[PDB]
Design a protein around this ligand. Structure first.
Ligand SMILES: *[C@@H]1O[C@H](CO[C@@H]2O[C@@H](C)[C@@H](O)[C@@H](O)[C@@H]2O)[C@@H](O[C@@H]2O[C@H](CO)[C@@H](O[C@@H]3O[C@H](CO[C@H]4O[C@H](CO)[C@@H](O)[C@H](O)[C@@H]4O)[C@@H](O)[C@H](O)[C@@H]3O)[C@H](O)[C@H]2NC(C)=O)[C@H](O)[C@H]1NC(C)=O
Ligand SMILES: *[C@@H]1O[C@H](CO)[C@@H](O[C@@H]2O[C@H](CO)[C@@H](O)[C@H](O)[C@H]2NC(C)=O)[C@H](O)[C@H]1NC(C)=O
Ligand SMILES: CCC(CC)O[C@@H]1C=C(C(=O)O)C[C@H](N)[C@H]1NC(C)=O
Ligand SMILES: CCC(CC)O[C@@H]1C=C(C(=O)O)C[C@H](N)[C@H]1NC(C)=O
Ligand SMILES: CCC(CC)O[C@@H]1C=C(C(=O)O)C[C@H](N)[C@H]1NC(C)=O
Ligand SMILES: CCC(CC)O[C@@H]1C=C(C(=O)O)C[C@H](N)[C@H]1NC(C)=O
Ligand SMILES: *[C@@H]1O[C@H](CO)[C@@H](O)[C@H](O)[C@H]1NC(C)=O
Ligand SMILES: *[C@@H]1O[C@H](CO)[C@@H](O)[C@H](O)[C@H]1NC(C)=O
Ligand SMILES: *[C@@H]1O[C@H](CO)[C@@H](O)[C@H](O)[C@H]1NC(C)=O
Ligand SMILES: *[C@@H]1O[C@H](CO)[C@@H](O)[C@H](O)[C@H]1NC(C)=O
Ligand SMILES: *[C@@H]1O[C@H](CO)[C@@H](O)[C@H](O)[C@H]1NC(C)=O
Ligand SMILES: *[C@@H]1O[C@H](CO)[C@@H](O)[C@H](O)[C@H]1NC(C)=O
Ligand SMILES: *[C@@H]1O[C@H](CO)[C@@H](O)[C@H](O)[C@H]1NC(C)=O
Ligand SMILES: *[C@@H]1O[C@H](CO)[C@@H](O)[C@H](O)[C@H]1NC(C)=O
Ligand SMILES: *[C@@H]1O[C@H](CO)[C@@H](O)[C@H](O)[C@H]1NC(C)=O
Ligand SMILES: *[C@@H]1O[C@H](CO)[C@@H](O)[C@H](O)[C@H]1NC(C)=O
Ligand SMILES: [Ca+2]
Ligand SMILES: [Ca+2]
Ligand SMILES: [Ca+2]
Ligand SMILES: [Ca+2]
Ligand SMILES: [Ca+2]
Ligand SMILES: [Ca+2]
Ligand SMILES: [Ca+2]
Ligand SMILES: [Ca+2]
Lengths: 388, 388, 388, 388
């Protein structure tokens, strides 16, 4: 075992090849599948795994009732192999958690699991399953983190957490973690900005995070930083607005776009010089559909012109959260860090007549070979037996 | 860990010893068993696995409704250990797929998973579960592949894909794949021939495939080739016709036999000089029964005389797809490549009064020791609870 | 990895410590557990496993109907870790089989699985899961074998099979198998004797088998042999009759005891010079209760006196088949071969009002430390939901 | 593999970080989850596992009826990975038992499983799953042991067993066990003391146990001993009484506190010089709530003054058994033995209107980083379908 180097560049990609689909909700109609949300993928040098926050309940059982609720003591972070349904019979226990991150440094898994009360939550860090550190809410208002993989470069792993309001200015901190021990943190000077649920990736020994502005931005904030936590901040300039909700595409801004700026959805994007691969919902108002857009000047330019669009979920089908993951050269044998993404397909409440809320997933990896647009939706027929 | 050599000849065999049976449909009446079709077996130097295309649904659940349908975004290629029922709790996720192939080169698994729309399908190629290449539809008309194992020789693996009409001339391509990367492909010049769902095996460093003529052939087409994809083509001459449907046995042809030629079923045969071991259904009109027939001049001769018949499934019992798989010397310690086969036992629609279609399997290995004819059918009592 | 020597003597034992209980039937009331009979235990140098003949059906499902039936094409030999319920989700497929044996030579697993028609059945032998030999019925009348572990000495494994009538003189053969290849077999000269379902163990480089006389013996036949298949034969002389059914205990015989001699139950016994540890039912007429008796002159003396009895299952509780297994010094680190046994607890037909027949198990290992008699019965409440 | 040294001292801790939660009862409403009680956690140098005593029945199935009952032949000691639900599909079978202990010496697991009748129970000792010894009841009155992990130092493992009345003076023995073989045992001279369900841990090469006085003590008894089983005895002096039931806090005693002394619950405490970390229920009269309390002079001082209290389960929520477990330097890489604990969250009879009694778990590890009080209760909604 050796540390992931994390020093090559992102592989340039022309399209996205489908990687996994788990059909969890479809299968949970009969089988024993966890009620989950906030799924994400992360890879070691040997395998890729789906992480997810369970609700301590299975689909189509009565304890699935009320799972629209975000935070409870029943929620646990757990993981299974990519593409498998998250079942009590195939899933490894990670942490007690209603917000979470994980990532593999090349040697062992780091996991971060926040539980406790809204006014004094605690992140428990584990390295190879052993508790190695904790960090407690500093603003006493729902300490929260990525809901996707943390990022590793040369034995140090990096994440972002937020504490404070979700409808106004909050506090955002960046952490450096080595063998599960926080060795440095910095609070971001980001007035008039808002970061949550950061999708962070390594690229040439530095970390880039694209996040959710729930306060007043329908474009996505970003923060990048080096191993010493010296950071830079911005918003994606493209007029192809990345958040949900959002306005129709028009002239963008390098600051937060206030039109339709309140609320949000967890998302991601990949920076390639001045350009950007944007993943987003197809609907401007609800979590429906998904598409990947290549905008060759979208990182720094404000026009709404793009070069490529690839359909992933159709506009009438349910989507939800999305995030980045990467495959490092140590895993693939390439000479670059490969970009991939997952989409959470949220089913049930609040949009459907169920007592429950849960998600299945799909993921894709970046390639330079031929690809195609389509729709790979969840496909469960709601309501279920328990609802009726 | 070492590449499969694939340079020895096929073991001569006098009969077929039963190797597995999963009883998947019988078990899925209560257990959590995927609805599947298109199963196949493939071996590494250490184990044999069953690969299959799920419908993203479990048996006796309402999501099994309409699983007569061949292609959807829910279908996934998964695998389990030979003879186990395909459950979400024992199945390894491979790829998102409504048509597939897989094989092991002696170092890692290659998997091939075709998904997307009928007019622009994409094969995703994975080596050790990492995406390593893609190939897209070149006739825009249901890109499709073997539904059985690809074949490997000295580090290269080979498969066949079809694109175009299923009731006429189509286009047929052969591929050389090393470590999941397509290193060469050739389009077959095969006018008035039709190939699909090819069953391919290695034999003396070369590949022989026996396929399905869905256009106008009630005997089976074949294609053989070397590692440079220089090929030869033909049809099995035996008057013991291999496809289903087909006419009653009579004088054969070394080109397509047009009588009952349209439509077909995936199948296989093994070439031994001028002779041929034929697997086929017992009914001439539907997928019922299965039998193995040794015809010592059937590869190249057109008479309907044969020397050995061994019963596998009784004529009143449902059958379906069948395909070759091999066990290499590296696995067996023999000095030859051992032929084996599997049979898909299809239950439900169109022939039975259910909302669903699914399959169990049985598999047999060639030996020169004493064997017996019998019937090992699926054994499920239809309809199921969900149908009623 | 080294061959089991098999050259030490049986360990002297004063009593039996409980080793495992799986509660299969109790648990299959709700969970997915196989309908099984003919369970047995066998150990490698690293673990012990339960082997069993499934009925290709789960408990409390409709396909359990009619499982009183002994032979069908749906029956499969499968194995799981000792003490775990036999489920499709924890069980490894071994062979298609309605009669069976298995044993580990120190290097790999040998398995023997008989399937096919009553008038021409075939035993398929596998070594590390690969077919290595077959042997076909020689009397065309239900080729059958041990339903317990075969016995291994220095790289050779030994079993017994019977072919012929179950109500009269039949034919009995002994086999020597190396790496799953039959290297020698002999037919026993045993007129007026009858051997089936032999429980065979190694002891000082020779094999001793205690078996079932279904023709005309209420005491148990035995056969012992050396590695060259030179054999000796006899019946257990003790007046503590070991078969079920049997008479009440009285003066025994060194030939078959005809009183209550027809029919039988698979059983075992362990020889210690002139003495014998007999495992048997508590009832003289049905498969109910179980007890272990030490009779210090019972191998060769005909009195009905014994020195020790240890209760295992109470007289009013269901028992069934039993058999020996051993733990070799390569596994335990002892300087002798440890004797152990399992009991099948048969539930359902013909004695209970169900559509099905199945069994759970218990096992014990011989020790010299303190032990106790009790009852560890099956404990399922019959009938089940599917019966009603 | 190397023996756990066990020679470092206990890590000083300032609070408890949440480590796991299995949600077993919530999940067993639909999933296949064992009815259990008496779980506990123990770790090897590679993993932590949950051990528990099943009732040989699954939740929401009719065989869970009457599971208030402590001792039966159906009860088995099994284990799974920490935080996973105890299911037949993820659980290792360990031993047949209605009382148990287990621990890992750095090389293999020792398991201890007591079954048989109340007047002659036998402890079966296993090392790496092989029977290596037994010990039988020496007072004929429910031989019983820890229900928590044994303690290991330099290849010796230690435990405590009780035999005799649970409402008066009984007999208490300590055992030294090497590779599953009892090498020494001592009967405790403890007149007017009562010990059972001991929680024992290593600390500087010596064992400290904190136990349950069921006779006449509402504080907890303790016994500490060296590797030769030379022991010292006493009761925790703190006026913060540790048992349940108990009186309200007031001046303590260094011998048994008779007020509310009869009856009790399994529990634990960690000694740090003259101080003590106490885990206890929040209710004085029933098994409800749980809290950790640091009393810097509570080992040897009788006042009811304490420094730190940390909430674990809220006072209106069901609690139950609790026990210590440790993580050795060999697992953690620390220079001290880390204390952890678990709490059994009992549901059903006698306090709720069900046919069954079962338990889920939560566990916590000691840290010197920031922590928080909260409530992590069982969370199931009773009654269940089977009760109605
Ligand atoms: C899904 O979940 C909802 C919401 O329920 C809440 O969360 C769930 C998970 C549980 O934790 C509940 O306890 C929570 O309430 C369910 O709605 C609840 O249904 C239950 C069952 O009917 C209701 O509980 C009953 O209420 C009865 C009415 O009592 C009230 O008035 C009487 C005077 O008549 C008075 O005595 C009492 O104090 C109440 O004020 C009561 O008689 C009975 O014993 C029982 O308590 C509960 O009120 C409902 N909650 C809400 C918020 O409406 C759904 O039933 C559930 N659906 C499914 C399909 O499972
Ligand atoms: C049982 O068999 C083993 C062989 O595996 C015998 O052990 C060997 O004996 C020879 C001397 O004849 C030595 O050269 C070897 O070193 C021994 N090998 C091992 C691994 O110990 C043993 O003598 C036989 N025991 C009995 C009881 O007959
Ligand atoms: C805490 C505020 C935050 C942003 C509105 O809510 C998140 C939004 C969510 C959402 O918009 O779907 C669901 C997340 N599970 C939740 N996070 C937490 C920690 O509860
Ligand atoms: C698409 C043409 C082809 C031949 C008619 O269809 C096959 C027929 C099938 C059949 O005869 O059973 C099943 C195959 N799953 C299907 N293949 C695809 C890719 O859908
Ligand atoms: C074949 C004769 C034999 C002895 C009567 O029947 C056995 C009796 C059985 C029994 O007495 O319970 C069950 C065995 N499964 C069966 N063996 C086979 C091969 O069917
Ligand atoms: C046997 C006396 C002892 C103390 C009353 O009983 C314990 C009480 C129990 C309890 O208070 O919950 C549960 C334990 N399973 C039980 N132990 C046994 C061996 O049955
Ligand atoms: C990246 O790191 C590797 C491994 O330490 C090193 O050998 C290589 O020189 C580095 N490459 C670049 C481009 O910095
Ligand atoms: C990577 O980390 C190691 C250990 O701290 C350090 O020695 C090395 O200089 C780092 N490498 C680079 C290229 O920064
Ligand atoms: C086949 O290949 C192996 C491995 O490369 C080689 O050693 C052997 O000589 C070859 N066999 C034949 C029949 O050519
Ligand atoms: C099957 O599909 C048809 C068509 O939509 C529908 O009418 C019927 O209700 C379905 N049956 C089940 C069991 O879902
Ligand atoms: C097998 O492939 C390797 C790599 O191309 C090559 O070195 C070797 O010559 C090949 N052997 C044969 C028989 O073609
Ligand atoms: C069991 O099988 C018989 C066939 O003999 C059938 O008549 C009966 O209805 C079946 N019973 C159940 C409960 O399915
Ligand atoms: C054990 O088997 C080996 C291999 O056949 C043989 O050489 C040896 O003589 C055997 N030993 C005994 C004691 O039979
Ligand atoms: C603890 O044991 C280790 C391993 O044997 C030893 O090296 C060390 O000296 C010991 N420490 C103490 C404090 O006794
Ligand atoms: C349930 O358990 C009780 C013990 O409390 C037992 O005596 C009774 O017979 C059982 N009742 C049913 C309906 O199974
Ligand atoms: C640990 O055990 C070994 C083996 O008995 C012994 O020789 C050694 O002295 C022991 N170490 C200590 C510190 O007791
Ligand atoms: Ca927003
Ligand atoms: Ca642009
Ligand atoms: Ca045809
Ligand atoms: Ca011919
Ligand atoms: Ca008899
Ligand atoms: Ca006698
Ligand atoms: Ca007490
Ligand atoms: Ca105090």
């Amino acid at each position: 075992s050796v540390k992931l180097a994390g020093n090559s560049s992102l592989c340039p990609v022309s399209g996205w090849a489908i990687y996994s689909k788990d059909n969890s909700v479809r299968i949970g109609s009969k089988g024993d599948v966890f009620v989950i949300r906030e799924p994400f993928i992360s890879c070691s040098p040997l395998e890729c795994r789906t992480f997810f926050l369970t609700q301590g309940a299975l689909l189509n059982d009565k304890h699935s009732n009320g799972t629209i609720k975000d935070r409870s003591p029943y929620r646990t972070l757990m993981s299974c192999p990519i593409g498998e349904v998250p079942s009590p019979y195939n899933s490894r226990f990670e942490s007690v958690a209603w917000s979470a991150s994980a990532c593999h440094d090349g040697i062992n898994w780091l996991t971060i699991g926040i539980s406790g009360p809204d006014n004094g939550a605690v992140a428990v860090l584990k390295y190879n399953g052993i508790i190695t550190d904790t960090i407690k809410s500093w603003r006493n208002n729902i300490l929260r983190t990525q809901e996707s993989e943390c990022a590793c470069v040369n034995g140090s792993c990096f994440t972002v957490m937020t504490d404070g309001p979700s409808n106004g200015q909050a506090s955002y901190k960046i952490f450096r973690i080595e063998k599960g021990k926080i060795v440095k943190s910095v609070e971001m000077n980001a007035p008039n900005y808002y970061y949550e649920e950061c999708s962070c990736y390594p690229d040439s020994s530095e970390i880039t995070c694209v996040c959710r502005d729930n306060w007043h931005g329908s474009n996505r904030p970003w923060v990048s930083f080096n191993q010493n936590l010296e950071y830079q901040i911005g918003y994606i300039c493209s007029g192809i607005f990345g958040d949900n909700p959002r306005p129709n595409d028009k002239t963008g801004s390098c600051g937060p776009v206030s039109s339709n700026g309140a609320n949000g959805v967890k998302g991601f994007s990949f920076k390639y010089g001045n350009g950007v691969w944007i993943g987003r919902t197809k609907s401007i108002s609800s979590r429906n559909g998904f598409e990947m857009i290549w905008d060759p000047n979208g990182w720094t330019g404000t026009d709404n012109n793009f070069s490529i669009k690839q359909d992933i979920v159709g506009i009438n089908e349910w989507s939800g959260y999305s995030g980045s993951f990467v495959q490092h050269p140590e895993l693939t044998g390439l000479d670059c860090i490969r970009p991939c993404f997952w989409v959470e397909l949220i089913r049930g409440r609040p949009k459907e007549n169920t007592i429950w809320t849960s998600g299945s997933s799909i993921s894709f990896c970046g390639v330079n070979s031929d690809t195609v647009g389509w729709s790979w939706p969840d496909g469960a027929e709601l309501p279920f037996t328990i609802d009726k």
